[PDB]
């Protein structure tokens, strides 16, 4: 046989990146998944996350209490986080016996897979009581955030999009949607109505509270080959189009 | 300028009027929510709330076990409640050590937003083991209860819709799935089916046990100019249309 | 004061004992401890020194 | 240049050489620390260590109690440790359910640095009831216990100075005070009787409880360049002046 890597006889090295580029192109295909990742990051350096995977379309929507850390199988000042919620849905509400929960998101990291179509991005950031924008009457349903995510890059490639906000001030107190499509360049989507009712409820769902964001690096977002922008700015994620 | 309140050129009263008037019917236009809220009164006076607000359509849909009493932080009987569960679910299933649990709805009330169309209103009210109606071979889904919703009203305006039921008895143990559409009185939906789908990610949802009706009203419904309709037939919420 | 003494201690209420102790050790010395957290909120975010008015500035250590 | 260590143009030695000379000498300056460290041995191998850190003097005074081990978040049999103390201080004074607290000292260290004048150190070795030698009014105050002290070395340097005395008798139940004061071969000292007066409060103090002698060697004297000396009479410190 011809020598490895001397020649276009090299089909080992053929198939190599032909692998990858079909992994690439079969998630950009309407038969491959859409994802959504919802990162909410805690003052303990713990990181919730919530991940759904999908066919055609993809979403999460959680309440303000949902986003709050919940340390499993520890203490949480379960009744005083009670009375925290009550003086976060209506100021002096409550009665609790902090000034500010160590349980409230610090911050939001959203991200999608880069089979999403940026531009079908929906994002619902409700106040602490799930209204959008003040009062239901005057709430459009969503606000269409596409232009704000930023591009994840490995070697030239996109990887995903991240849209990242900090909720620093007291008063960050949010319920969260958001939701977006899979990539569809065709004209094709009449007849596929049932199978997208369906993909629903195929929609798989994952959560878990990781204590820091080295672990969700290293054990989350690395081995699953997800994108990822850390703190400092650092890109991870697995180049596949046309690379070995 | 002109005197307050003397003439066709109070801008300032005519810009009142208009803003007031375009939350009304921002929010029967396409573009708004609709909104629904399940309210379960238990014996102690405490009320959940279950609120979801979304654009196009909107529902709830709790288990038997979903709607019980949960105090936060408190004691529950958390074993003697599984027992009772058994007991709801076939009689004499469990080996519980009370007649009546507590925990049990002594009512609903169902309340949706003055956007939906009342005629699209469907409810599922199942017994304890999520059947609408014995044995789901004769089940039909859902039954179309428009018609026992009473117009919430103030100041002549129809601020929401409500429909209310007490479960006194002893055997009235339900499960509970509701659903509107929002109001559409034109002949526009081809085109926008992907955009339901999106809805159905970007719904917000809320729940919460408030101590009593009262708090309800002044923490819950007040605030966030929502409608209700007390115990003692009073009607809650703010009219807009035409109005400062 | 020792860095433990300036960590909050909430009176009469649950404060993660066992795992603070162990979260000393890893500040005391890298991957000293084995505690359950990357940050504990009970570490100070900040400190103000105030003086009364009769002091003198110049002293001050 | 010239080559690595051959000639006297080997700046980069030279400063290595008075980067460590100087460490050593600023040290045994007035403007530099003297410190001491009290090392409380307990039958589960673990030790508690004291240390403090100052200008001019520096001292440790601790309580018979204060000694006695106490394991953080974990059960110190606190109520029948109440009982033993009040067994200590007077015989048959407490109702304990234990002949030994095993929460008793069953050693002393203590270490000075090497900045310290060792015929300075006194040592107030109490009984339980803080009493220097059997009643107060026949006590003086200290016992100045300079000669007991063993150099500490390495490669020839004095690293520090230690005073080692075990407890291994029932009887032995101690409160301890040790002092010393830093080196002064100079005649100044008038005009800075203000300056000592704040190093009092300037003093920096540390305790904390470590499981096992290897782990105060690895993790708490070897980090910061602390001189020890284990139970195998090994010397731990770095040595300094005119060493690179
Ligand atoms: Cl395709
Ligand atoms: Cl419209
Ligand atoms: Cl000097």
Redesign the interface.
């Known amino acids: 046989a011809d020598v490895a890597g001397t020649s276009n006889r090299d089909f080992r090295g053929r198939e190599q990146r032909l692998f990858n580029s079909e992994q690439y192109n079969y998630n950009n295909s309407l038969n491959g998944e859409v994802s959504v990742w919802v990162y909410a990051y805690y003052?303990?350096?713990?990181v919730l996350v919530i991940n759904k995977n999908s066919q055609?379309?993809?979403?999460?929507?959680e309440?303000?209490?949902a986003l709050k850390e919940y340390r499993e199988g520890?203490?949480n000042?379960?009744?005083?986080?009670?009375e925290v919620?009550?003086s976060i849905?209506?100021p002096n509400?409550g009665d609790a016996?902090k000034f500010h929960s160590?349980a409230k998101p610090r911050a939001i990291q959203i991200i999608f897979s880069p089979s999403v179509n940026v531009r079908?991005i929906?994002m619902?950031k409700?106040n602490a009581?799930?209204?959008?924008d003040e009062?239901?009457?005057?709430?459009?349903?969503?606000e269409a955030t596409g232009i704000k995510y930023r591009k994840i890059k490995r070697d030239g490639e996109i990887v995903g999009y991240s849209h990242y906000f900090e909720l620093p001030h007291e008063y960050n107190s949010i319920?969260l949607?958001?939701?977006g499509?899979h990539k569809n360049p065709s004209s094709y989507?009449v007849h596929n109505?049932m199978d997208?009712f369906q993909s629903?409820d195929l929609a798989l769902r994952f959560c878990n509270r990781y204590?820091?964001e080295?672990e969700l690096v290293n054990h989350y977002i690395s081995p699953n080959a997800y994108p990822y922008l850390d703190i400092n700015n650092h890109s991870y994620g697995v180049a596949l189009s046309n690379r070995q």
């Open positions: 003052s303990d350096g713990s055609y379309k993809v979403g999460i929507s309440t303000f209490k520890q203490h000042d379960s009744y005083d986080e009670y919620n009550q849905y209506y509400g016996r160590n079908t929906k619902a409700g009581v799930s209204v959008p009062y239901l009457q005057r709430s459009h349903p969503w319920s949607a958001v939701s499509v989507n109505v997208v629903c204590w820091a080295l």
